[PDB]
Design a protein around this ligand. Structure first.
Ligand SMILES: O=C(Nc1nncn1C1CC1)[C@H]1CCOc2ccc(Cl)cc21
Ligand SMILES: O=C(Nc1nncn1C1CC1)[C@H]1CCOc2ccc(Cl)cc21
Lengths: 304, 304
């Protein structure tokens, strides 16, 4: 038993991390097959970032200007192209450590692990959620750009995020591996305010199921509710509306614990209305929303 | 910016995980050089665990009874010995993926990453602290025994923990890599109650410094305190006593923020006495104690 904010093992992704330098800018790249993926803002100076014309800036760059280093060995760049906000640097060597992989665009509320890197070297791994306002709350310093988010299904790594920037509010923004930003954000140093950071309701419920499975039951009450009644309370508390799709997704957790989804919604409703009263749930004093129902099942079953 | 419960990249440790089976028991082992380390309770049946005589049980086991599998390939066991609560299985092949490593016995309050494994395969990685009562609060299911805790200094992996059991209270106990248990626990299915789980005061202060560095400053007050006055409050709240050694260890964080350690102790004192009042610090509603002052410096500087 016990429930932890668990990240995927990062070894498969560590073997893909490289350093990419263009001029005076060094960031991280992802080396998969004979392609290195990195944020296109590697071509920018700090001045350029204020209003960059990436196509115009890219004209002044040749293959030899992109310095790609894997460990202590240099990769030869034989091609470069821009796909949305990412650059794809074709190298002459396929990464021998390339795992089975996919590029996936996640939905808000989904979780992933981030392997934070600096100069192509891994510093740490943590679990994140794509917030409903399309930001992530990570831990990224200067040089962390190009660090990636991913999920693993046994031996296939699904890359879902590449880190690009920190908004003036300290939250993070990035793209999928096709270079498309999550949300309305652009790779420009400009006023970009995030929208409302609502709570991922289906994730909180999944985490409440994880608590029951792991012994924390104090919050279970004698009440039930309806999707409409629950949603009225969820609106008031900046919680995402719960749909029948979410109820169906919670089905296996409901079956395992014997607690109907709407009964758990009524427990969540009372927690929102009365608070925790100085108590904790799974060692947390707030309602945790960065565990999906799939993460809960996976962690509680031991998927390797 | 941003501060996350970050684990070390686990690739170096993933390459050491093997499956060890003895009879009907399968658990994880750590393969370093030509030795596989695993909990000695791999030789036990569920009945034996009630009152095992490990030396007597071990007499009935030969090298061929320990089945060691690395991925899909079997390792030949050419020797076996018991060192405290761990078995050391000598194999005929040195692990080609053996990283630079040390075996270290950590002190209560120190942190480490756990690579949770099942059948020699990694399932996930999370950051833990050795509690002051010598337990850890992990996420371990049946089959997770032999999963290890470690820290990394650039390329050297310091193994500090091997998972052995879950106490009836859901907390976890284990040994260092010499097989010595942390705390008073024994590898026997018996009444083993944990002592008081006090809060790691020096870690909370380090995390309060991390909050200031990352923008969360609401809790800073106009007060100061003394080590003795602070410790009176810390005793009342089941916080570990703060020593001058702890103040010295917080020195670089104090210097970076310009907030004297005793002033931060006065902030912590008011937080203990008044609570958070429904507010959060680094996205937490409670005082976090599983970040050491070294973790805070490391995360805030970007050590790879
Ligand atoms: O935000 C940035 N990258 C990063 N990633 N995670 C965190 N941080 C930094 C620490 C903010 C870059 C990309 C956008 O253009 C600029 C412009 C100025 C500066 Cl200082 C940084 C950046
Ligand atoms: O606690 C155990 N290992 C484990 N590790 N982390 C978690 N869990 C299990 C889930 C409790 C083992 C070792 C002690 O002897 C026994 C005896 C009975 C049983 Cl059921 C398990 C065990």
């Amino acid at each position: 038993s016990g429930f932890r904010k668990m990240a995927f093992p990062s070894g498969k992704v560590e073997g893909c991390m490289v350093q990419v330098t263009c001029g005076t800018t060094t960031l991280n790249g992802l080396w998969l097959d004979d392609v290195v993926y990195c944020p296109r803002h590697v071509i920018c100076t700090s001045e350029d970032m204020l209003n960059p014309n990436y196509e115009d800036l890219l004209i002044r760059k040749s293959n030899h200007n992109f310095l790609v280093q894997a460990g202590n060995v240099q990769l030869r760049v034989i091609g470069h192209s821009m796909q949305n906000c990412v650059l794809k640097l074709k190298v002459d060597t396929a990464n021998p450590k390339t795992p089975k992989y996919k590029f996936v665009r996640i939905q808000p509320g989904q979780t992933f692990s981030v392997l934070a890197c600096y100069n192509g070297s891994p510093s740490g791994v943590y679990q994140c959620a794509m917030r409903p306002n399309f930001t992530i709350k990570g831990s990224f310093l200067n040089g962390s750009c190009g660090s990636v988010g991913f999920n693993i299904d046994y031996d296939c790594v699904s890359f879902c995020y590449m880190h690009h920037m920190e908004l003036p509010t300290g939250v993070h923004a990035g793209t999928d591996l096709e270079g498309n930003f999550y949300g309305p954000f652009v790779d420009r140093q400009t006023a970009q305010a995030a929208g409302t950071d609502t709570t991922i309701t289906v994730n909180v419920l999944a985490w409440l199921y994880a608590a029951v499975i792991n012994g924390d039951r104090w919050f279970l009450n004698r009440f039930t509710t309806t999707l409409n009644d629950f949603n009225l309370v969820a609106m008031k508390y900046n919680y995402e509306p719960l749909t029948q799709d979410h109820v169906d997704i919670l089905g296996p957790l409901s079956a395992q614990t014997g607690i109907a989804v709407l009964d758990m919604c009524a427990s969540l409703k009372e927690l929102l209305q009365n608070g925790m009263n100085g108590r904790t749930i799974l060692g947390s004093a707030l309602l945790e929303d960065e565990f999906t129902p799939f993460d809960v099942v996976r962690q509680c079953s031991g998927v390797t």
